[PDB]
Design a protein around this nucleic acid. Structure first.
Ligand code: CL
Ligand code: CL
Ligand code: K
Ligand code: MG
Ligand code: MG
Ligand code: MG
Ligand code: MG
Ligand code: MG
Ligand code: MG
Ligand code: MG
Ligand code: MG
Ligand code: MG
Ligand code: MG
Ligand code: NA
Ligand code: NA
Ligand code: NA
Ligand code: NA
Ligand code: NA
Ligand code: NA
Ligand code: NA
Ligand code: NA
Ligand code: NA
Ligand code: NA
Ligand code: NA
Ligand code: SR
Ligand code: SR
Ligand code: SR
Ligand code: SR
Ligand code: SR
Lengths: 65, 119, 46, 194, 81
RNA sequence: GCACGGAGGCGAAGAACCAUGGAUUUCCGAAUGAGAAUCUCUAACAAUUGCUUCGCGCAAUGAGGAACCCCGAGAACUGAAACAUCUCAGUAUCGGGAGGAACAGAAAACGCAAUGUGAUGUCGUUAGUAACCGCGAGUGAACGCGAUACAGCCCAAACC
RNA sequence: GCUUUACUGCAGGCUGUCGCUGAG
């Protein structure tokens, strides 16, 4: 959602990787909030983060990095 | 070994190969057991060479007797690859035949003679 | 007994499968865990 | 004129006479000390090999195989049998020894395919055959007009299905007329009565 | 490429280990070693790891008990997530 | 998703869904660095082969598939109103192996004997005929003919 | 299932012969 494919392709190889580490962190913090039984969740994003990461990873392979 | 009934001195073998090398540059020579065999049969052969390290032996076992009943003289060489080199080949040759020498008839004649004596 | 790491993973899975069909599945399907096992009454593999 | 090849041939019409006799007596001593399957650089019977399709080329291999002489090495029935099915001693197998030799050679060279084979004698307790095998994956063969046919997928493991010359003969396929009612097109299609 | 840290293991026992022994507990990939768990933890929260104890759990996962140096404060670290 | 829940999210930046192509594709598994009840230990075509730059450098094999197919091993109950040859049956089952189909196949054929046919399967028929057989019970073709489909070639050697 | 100088066979052992197998 929030992150579209164009934007990902418009990023440089360095931006994708930085963007990747950033998304992985948001995800890790979400799973931590969930593990803590935290309710301030948003089940949609925790799901979106996974897809976004798959997209970036898919784009990284396509562009050669 | 089973077809070799006499041993040829390293020196006699030397003269023969030299005579064979000058035979290809001057006269005519046959390379290979088949071509050699036909030469003997057609009688167009003066001197035939036969390697002694041929395996299987069946390839050349016939040369000796076929040569005798055709009056064609023959001589043994120890190495298969030398005969092939002397014959001008990049490989080996189980048998060879000098089909009419060339500026070597003298030597080739002596060799044949030296062999008959060698029995 | 002495369980290996893998044996332990398999036992763990079996334990997990032993949970019940969540309440919401009932409402959603508008109305049983057939693979309900008991440590004593049943016998797992291995 | 006669080919030199004809002389190897003529020698082998009577392996027990002449020089060939002495060669065999000498050779078998070494053969008896070799293994079941020995790859050899050159055919012992050149005329026969070339005649069967052999060529001095890359991808062409020759191997000598030895097999025990005699009938079937069978175990006596451990259960009930009518007198008819109690035999042991006079029972012989349905594949000739040459065929057994071809298969052993082929098993030794899994990637190669049997092209043909021929006999090179025997002593009192074993028989030797030489087998020609071809490398279907070597380009020198894939480009040969006389051998490239053996590269086809359906020629894989041909020996094990009886597609060899020795195989076809042993299957009673030599005759095109009388006598081949139960052999052609296959022993199996004819209910195994051939 | 599997990651080392899966998520913080938060339970009554974990909290005590955090308040009383300056230890943090994590659910980690069972293929991860004590060393790989130490490194990962330092690189994720910028802290110094003193000791790591592990346990393959009856949940099919690996639990890690990570003690931080007196220089760091577990309570504060875990509180920012 | 099955699956009609709660919460929440995605979709006009055209989602869902469908077709084609691509990405990702843990561990064990022929399982192949060594070992192991799916894990572990210290760079790997393990093993057998072909080629070979003789170095795993280039390649092959292995295992699977409903049956069908080819090559080998091969019963007994049963029938004969007993039973041994015979029968059940080259069946059941076993070993090995290929393909999309296999196998066969261009006559050292046939032998309606001919001034005739003309590779090979298969189908119909020839026929329960010829032949076999404690001449018992039973077993059992072929040539030909009518069809289907059709297609003929390559080596070894001679001479080079 | 078991027995035996029941019927018929089958392993196995002994023995001759042929091949392996040659010279005087
Ligand atoms: Cl084969
Ligand atoms: Cl006719
Ligand atoms: K019976
Ligand atoms: Mg529980
Ligand atoms: Mg040609
Ligand atoms: Mg058929
Ligand atoms: Mg421990
Ligand atoms: Mg392994
Ligand atoms: Mg009866
Ligand atoms: Mg019968
Ligand atoms: Mg009767
Ligand atoms: Mg019958
Ligand atoms: Mg007929
Ligand atoms: Na139990
Ligand atoms: Na093979
Ligand atoms: Na978990
Ligand atoms: Na996939
Ligand atoms: Na391989
Ligand atoms: Na190599
Ligand atoms: Na009866
Ligand atoms: Na009875
Ligand atoms: Na009968
Ligand atoms: Na007619
Ligand atoms: Na009984
Ligand atoms: Sr050579
Ligand atoms: Sr009990
Ligand atoms: Sr195969
Ligand atoms: Sr639990
Ligand atoms: Sr036709």
């Amino acid at each position: 959602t929030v992150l579209h494919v164009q934007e990902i392709r418009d990023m440089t190889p360095a931006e994708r990787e930085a963007e990747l580490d950033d998304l992985k962190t948001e995800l890790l913090n979400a799973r931590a909030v969930q593990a803590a039984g935290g309710a301030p969740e948003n089940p949609g994003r925790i799901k979106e983060l996974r897809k976004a990461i798959a997209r970036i990873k898919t784009i990284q392979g396509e562009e050669g990095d | 070994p089973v077809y070799v009934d006499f041993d040829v001195p390293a020196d006699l073998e030397d003269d023969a190969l030299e005579a064979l090398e000058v035979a290809r540059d001057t006269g005519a020579v046959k390379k290979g057991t088949n071509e050699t065999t036909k030469s003997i049969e057609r009688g167009s052969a003066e001197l035939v060479f036969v390697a002694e390290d041929v395996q299987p032996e069946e390839i050349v076992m016939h040369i000796p007797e076929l040569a005798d009943e055709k009056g064609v003289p023959f001589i043994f060489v120890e190495q298969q690859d030398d005969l092939g080199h002397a014959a001008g080949l990049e490989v080996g040759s189980a048998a060879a035949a000098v089909t009419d020498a060339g500026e070597a008839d003298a030597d080739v004649e002596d060799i044949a003679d030296k062999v008959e004596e060698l029995r | 007994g002495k369980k290996s790491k893998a044996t332990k993973k398999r036992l763990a899975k079996l334990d997990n499968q032993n949970s019940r069909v969540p309440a919401w599945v009932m409402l959603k399907t508008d109305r049983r865990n057939h693979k309900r096992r008991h440590w004593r009454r049943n016998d797992t593999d291995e | 004129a006669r080919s030199a090849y004809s002389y190897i041939r003529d020698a082998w019409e009577n392996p027990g006479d002449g020089q060939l006799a002495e060669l065999q007596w000498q050779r078998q001593q070494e053969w008896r000390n070799e293994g079941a399957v020995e790859r050899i650089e050159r055919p012992t019977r050149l005329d026969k090999a070339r005649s069967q399709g052999y060529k001095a080329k890359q991808g062409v291999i020759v191997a000598r195989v030895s097999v025990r002489k005699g009938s079937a090495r069978k175990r006596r029935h451990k259960a009930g049998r009518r007198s008819k099915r109690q035999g042991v001693t006079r029972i012989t197998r349905r594949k000739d020894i040459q065929r057994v030799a071809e298969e052993r050679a082929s098993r030794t060279f899994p990637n190669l395919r049997v092209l043909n084979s021929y006999s090179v004698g025997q002593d009192g307790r074993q028989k030797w055959h030489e087998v020609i095998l071809i490398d279907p994956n070597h380009p020198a063969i894939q480009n040969d007009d006389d051998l490239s046919w053996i590269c086809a997928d359906d020629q894989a493991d041909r020996v094990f299905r009886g597609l060899t010359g020795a195989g076809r003969r042993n299957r009673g396929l030599s005759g095109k007329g009388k006598g081949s009612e139960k052999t052609r097109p296959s022993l199996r299609s004819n209910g195994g009565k051939a | 490429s599997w990651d080392v840290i899966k998520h913080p293991h938060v339970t009554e026992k974990a909290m005590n280990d955090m308040d009383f022994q300056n230890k943090l507990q994590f659910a980690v990939d069972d293929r991860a070693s004590k060393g790989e768990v130490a490194d990962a933890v330092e690189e994720q929260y910028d802290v110094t790891v003193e000791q790591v104890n592990t346990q393959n759990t009856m949940d099919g996962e690996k639990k890690a008990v990570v003690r931080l140096s007196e220089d760091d404060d577990a309570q504060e670290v875990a509180s920012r997530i």
